[PDB]
Amino acid sequence: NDTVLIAGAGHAGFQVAVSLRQAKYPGRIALINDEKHLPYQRPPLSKAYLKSGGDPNSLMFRPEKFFQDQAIELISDRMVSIDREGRKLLLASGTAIEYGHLVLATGARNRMLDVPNASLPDVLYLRTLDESEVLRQRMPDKKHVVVIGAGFIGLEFAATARAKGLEVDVVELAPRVMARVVTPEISSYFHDRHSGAGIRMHYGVRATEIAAEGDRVTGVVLSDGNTLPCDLVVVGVGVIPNVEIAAAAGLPTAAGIIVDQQLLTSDPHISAIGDCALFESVRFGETMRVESVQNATDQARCVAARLTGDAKPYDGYPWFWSDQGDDKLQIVGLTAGFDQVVIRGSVAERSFSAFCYKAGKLIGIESVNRAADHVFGRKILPLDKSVTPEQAADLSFDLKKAAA
Numbered sequence: 001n002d003t004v005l006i007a008g009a010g011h012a013g014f015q016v017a018v019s020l021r022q023a024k025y026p027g028r029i030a031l032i033n034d035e036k037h038l039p040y041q042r043p044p045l046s047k048a049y050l051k052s053g054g055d056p057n058s059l060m061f062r063p064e065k066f067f068q069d070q071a072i073e074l075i076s077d078r079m080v081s082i083d084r085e086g087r088k089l090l091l092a093s094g095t096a097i098e099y100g101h102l103v104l105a106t107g108a109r110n111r112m113l114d115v116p117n118a119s120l121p122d123v124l125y126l127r128t129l130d131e132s133e134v135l136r137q138r139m140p141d142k143k144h145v146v147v148i149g150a151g152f153i154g155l156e157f158a159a160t161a162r163a164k165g166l167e168v169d170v171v172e173l174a175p176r177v178m179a180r181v182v183t184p185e186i187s188s189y190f191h192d193r194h195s196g197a198g199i200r201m202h203y204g205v206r207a208t209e210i211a212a213e214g215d216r217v218t219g220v221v222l223s224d225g226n227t228l229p230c231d232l233v234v235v236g237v238g239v240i241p242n243v244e245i246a247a248a249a250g251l252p253t254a255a256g257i258i259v260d261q262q263l264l265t266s267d268p269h270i271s272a273i274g275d276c277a278l279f280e281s282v283r284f285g286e287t288m289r290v291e292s293v294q295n296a297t298d299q300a301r302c303v304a305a306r307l308t309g310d311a312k313p314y315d316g317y318p319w320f321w322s323d324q325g326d327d328k329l330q331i332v333g334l335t336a337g338f339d340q341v342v343i344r345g346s347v348a349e350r351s352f353s354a355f356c357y358k359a360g361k362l363i364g365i366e367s368v369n370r371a372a373d374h375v376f377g378r379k380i381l382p383l384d385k386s387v388t389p390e391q392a393a394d395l396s397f398d399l400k401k402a403a404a
């Protein structure tokens, strides 16, 4: 067959469809979308949107007419099974489709809070437009929310809930916030900023039970035995890559759908991109899964480029960002295994960067309200070039000249 079937119409799904057309792909392109919304943006969900008037499709990538003009078949359905041998995609509507090449961009789903009463009505998640909209409408009728999970999303939400007048308590099991993604100097800064806004941070604890009265949430019980009163709970304790269906078809999976340097599964005719993909990284010499718009986007481009001619190893350089309250956090590079951190700028001035090193080499830059340092990293890191810790701290050391 000639048709390219895309399962999942989020960032990666939408981008591969678009990039496929830009590259003048002749075949048919079907985009399976299991949500009652035109493909939309995720980043605004825990940011601006929570502050908007809730405009139905204000987060749409492109308007409805776009998919028609682009010959991208937008199918309002969901894949449930994959017939690799018959190269057919089995939808839930009962329908079935043959494919030349199958692109899996199923992303990842919320990991359910595994605690008593965790499923009461007032225990909400925050990852889909729908979930964002209910939370937006629910906050005005709530006085106190406990946020479980100090990840990016949880804090982006916490600041807004606080800004709206709600009482806010953040529950994190680790000793500091964003422990899975940033170095201590960043956690510290944000701990101060949020605390300063009146948000009460709680470290070293897990939720062990959701205290309720009738079926009304009244608090969150912690592993230290104490209970934090609240009438609303927002949980962000991780996701689960959607690999089930692919695994059901015999495709290797783990913490994501396994793919090689070219984002291909063990079955040619089937690729995996975005949050759902556990790819082989030539640059970093290891298999990993990355959750970011950058990753979804660059991976989509890589596949689109392959299915149209030049098959190259995926090498989208990783970078992320987060908008918490009035502060902007930008990260370029992977900081895992950092053994030396240098501060450039001033924490007091609320504009600085943490230059992270490992074995004497710059591995990443975490910039708070300092776009210039981020541009420096985005240019230098992909080239695998570095700057000494001494130079990073020196405000008289010109980053523009260094990156020319």
Ligand SMILES: Cc1cc2nc3c(=O)[nH]c(=O)nc-3n(C[C@H](O)[C@H](O)[C@H](O)COP(=O)(O)OP(=O)(O)OC[C@H]3O[C@@H](n4cnc5c(N)ncnc54)[C@H](O)[C@@H]3O)c2cc1C
Residues within 6 Å of the ligand: 007, 008, 009, 010, 011, 012, 013, 014, 032, 033, 034, 035, 042, 043, 044, 045, 046, 077, 078, 079, 080, 105, 106, 107, 108, 126, 127, 128, 153, 242, 245, 273, 274, 275, 276, 290, 291, 292, 293, 294, 296, 319, 320, 321, 322, 323
């Ligand atoms: C609230 C929020 C804020 C974020 N903010 C940022 C940010 O500021 N910066 C950043 O870099 N990243 C951010 N991210 C992460 C970013 O959204 C993800 O990295 C990106 O969406 C991953 O793209 P994706 O295409 O793989 O999957 P997603 O966008 O999640 O889309 C997956 C889509 O596939 C659908 N689907 C799943 N299974 C099936 C199936 N079997 N059949 C059909 N359809 C299916 C899903 O319902 C969904 O619509 C944020 C994420 C969230 C949730």
